[PDB]
Amino acid sequence: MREIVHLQAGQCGNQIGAKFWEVISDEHGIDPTGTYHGDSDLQLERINVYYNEATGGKYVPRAVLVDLEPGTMDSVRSGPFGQIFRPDNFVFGQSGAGNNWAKGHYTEGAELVDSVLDVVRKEAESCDCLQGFQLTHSLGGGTGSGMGTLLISKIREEYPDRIMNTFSVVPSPKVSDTVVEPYNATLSVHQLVENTDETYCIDNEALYDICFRTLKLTTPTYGDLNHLVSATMSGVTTCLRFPGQLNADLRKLAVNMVPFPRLHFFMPGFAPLTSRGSQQYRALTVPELTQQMFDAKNMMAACDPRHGRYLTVAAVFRGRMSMKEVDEQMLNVQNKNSSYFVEWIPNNVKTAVCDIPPRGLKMSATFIGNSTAIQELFKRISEQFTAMFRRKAFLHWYTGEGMDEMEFTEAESNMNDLVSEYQQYQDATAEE
């Protein structure tokens, strides 16, 4: 029936996808072998969304891993749950991307793309009807950003009537992994704003700051961030995975919180982010959750939403509390915090509570909203791109591939238009 096909791209995308698969398998009671070992009720009916029915009740995952380097599949296969996936989905090349978008798209995006299109077409034809496609990748390299955009464009061209949601990782000047990273982010943003339904902003520095100042972890590593993004994904997807009283779906969310297709970026965020020694001294209530979802401390942003105005806010709850508290809380927030949201459009907060609590935690709820805070990231990316494109540094590598430089010019024109649009919609005045 209604199933969701999952996609993989980039080494960071691959690791976060594996973490999410392990998290959902543990939550829904799946042993590392491949059988079922759950003890719940809603873990058998709608379990076919991400799995596939086979003989002996052995559900198989539904995710295609796309990569250019064979070293990632070996790393992810030796894990405790790396023996359950489909090795056929591990379509890897022989040459690495080299953190090049143009080279990865041109050379490693021609003779390898056919296999992944064939397998995704086979998976789509295997089921009866679908809703959308989820792809988790990163903009830091030629692996995630190099082919994720191409695959999204291909699937949109083939099946226009599908959901294109992604969780790409935005860069940061403070924490960088590539010298030509702003080039690749520049090239990827064009495809993101032209051939993508919606996109969520993912940052590592903000997650590190959160886990340092609130979680207070001893040795925070990538595993913690993978767990956090997996939990955020599960909280987002529980609206359809576990139906409750007020259920939601991805397409309704995309329609309701995207005022204009040119602006489809979002701001994700969880809420119960507490230290180890604080877990046994907490008050599980509504106002605390509202405060942790409204303050800028708990958000995973390397920015400040207080610099702009709230455009669209969606609070997805997962638990058994009430209905009146959410509406009264949002009402008094809009009454008090009036200069933080768009005045011209009232009731910018959407109510959604999942009656099914998660496994291992009773009170869980995510925060999905689109506030006016990405503008500084966009302008700093534009400034750094202009600075490096002035004297044309690190450009011979892209020129030798075959692609010209006009692409950079049209791209920077596009970001200039987009940021102009963003700042002239930031100050949405009532009248003259």
Binding site: N99, V179, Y208, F212, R391, F394, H396
Partner: protein
């Protein structure tokens, strides 16, 4: 998969290759016999050894490297060693006449005689491999064998493989101390070949090695073995994510793509740390921030140049051992705000994160102690341009009335090459100056 071929030209290249191979065999538990006689007590070896070694049907390992030299004395010296049962005699090509710090002979009348043999050998080695990314050419600028023969072979390898990475590793004639006199004569001709026909080049000297060993290792009697060990450790640290894995693997292409900002400026500044002895590795707390800060100190550089004179273009950080990401982030936050370190108004940041789970090992009889983690630095700055300026000054001052040039004339070569190399180096220095100048 990730397989590369090493090239060793000259005595220095051969000894460096031997040091690298012995380091690899000791770190991977590879016995000198070539098999695994360890049937009673195992001590490792279940890893990915296919990157450098090869597996036979009988459980044997064959090194994949090129050991060529014009003088047979080095070949005989290595042959009479205790590792002679590891490689193959066909990989060690002797020679009747040698260059011995001479370019004209080793490029025209000596190096041109043994061409087809080495080409067939390297073709066979490449055919024996599946995935090829780059090459490890080891030579020297002072040694005539490592200058004339190396240039003529690389000029052909470049036109035979345009899609493969072409690395370079050799020794720079130090301004203060030197071994021979005609070293810049070969250097001025080798630099043009390495610039207009190669993609990247690494430049190191011995004086800085001497200074660092006397300052940290505190040895009054140094030897070539320690220098070779340092170079091998550097090479292993650079190519660490290939034999093994980690949180963020960094292949040859991944760092080589960004390490080259321009086709003319491809001379990074390596920095290995910590370079410490046994007693220097016990009473000393080792974290990431301290060693990263020490990496930018001019005293720890293997090139005698003050970083404060210029500024950096591109930076490439590598790590090896148990390293925690938070320490790397804190170090980045510290260095990005350091006023001493200079950079351009156009590159606020750029660098890499290579996490290697396997820590560096030790050797019985060596000077390196057991360190929990390691760090390697490859930065691009214009302050190193003084070395080429000094070399050009030396070439100009000894070319005025043609000291020791009549032999090169008699051997057969154009005198105009000297002026061509001079003007090419002048243009390169001009380009470096222009790039260093900001708005």
């Amino acid at each position: 998969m990730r397989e590369c071929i090493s090239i060793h030209v000259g005595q220095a290249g051969v000894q460096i290759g031997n040091a690298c191979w012995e380091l690899y065999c000791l770190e991977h538990g590879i016995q000198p016999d070539g098999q695994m006689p360890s049937d009673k007590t195992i001590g490792g070896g279940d890893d990915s050894f296919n990157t450098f070694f090869s597996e036979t049907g009988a459980g044997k390992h064959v090194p994949r490297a090129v050991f060529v030299d014009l003088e047979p004395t080095v070949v005989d010296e290595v042959r009479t060693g205790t590792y002679r049962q590891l490689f193959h005699p066909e990989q060690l090509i002797t020679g009747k006449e040698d260059a011995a710090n001479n370019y004209a002979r080793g490029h025209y009348t000596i190096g041109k005689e043994i061409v087809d043999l080495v080409l067939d050998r390297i073709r066979k080695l490449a055919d024996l491999c599946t995935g090829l990314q780059g090459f490890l050419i080891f030579h020297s600028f002072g040694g005539g064998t490592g200058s004339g023969f190396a240039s003529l072979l690389m000029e052909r390898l470049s036109v035979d493989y345009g899609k493969k990475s072409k690395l370079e590793f050799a020794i720079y004639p130090a301004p203060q101390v030197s071994t021979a006199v005609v070293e810049p004569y070969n250097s001025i001709l080798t630099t043009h070949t390495t610039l207009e026909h190669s993609d990247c080049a690494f430049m190191v000297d011995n004086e800085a090695i001497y200074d660092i060993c006397r300052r940290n290792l505190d040895i009054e009697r140094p030897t070539y073995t320690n220098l070779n060990r340092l170079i091998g450790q550097i090479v292993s640290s650079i190519t660490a994510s290939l034999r093994f894995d980690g949180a963020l693997n960094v292949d040859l292409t991944e760092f080589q793509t960004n390490l080259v900002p321009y086709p003319r400026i491809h001379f990074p500044l390596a920095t290995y740390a910590p370079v410490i002895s046994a007693e220097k590795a016990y009473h000393e707390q080792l974290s990431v921030a301290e060693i990263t800060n020490a990496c930018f100190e001019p005293a720890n550089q293997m090139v005698k140049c003050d970083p404060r004179h210029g500024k950096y273009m591109a930076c490439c950080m590598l790590y090896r051992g148990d390293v925690v990401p938070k320490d790397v982030n804190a170090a980045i936050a510290t260095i990005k705000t350091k006023r001493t370190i200079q950079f351009v108004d156009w590159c606020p940041t750029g660098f890499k994160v290579g996490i290697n789970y396997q820590p560096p090992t030790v050797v019985p009889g060596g000077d390196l102690a057991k360190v929990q983690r390691a760090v390697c630095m490859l930065s691009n700055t214009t302050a190193i341009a003084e070395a080429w300026a000094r070399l050009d000054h030396k070439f100009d001052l000894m070319y005025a009335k043609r000291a020791f040039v009549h032999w090169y004339v008699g051997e057969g070569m154009e005198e105009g090459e000297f002026s061509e190399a001079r003007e090419d180096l002048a243009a390169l220095e001009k380009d470096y100056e222009e790039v260093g100048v900001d708005s």
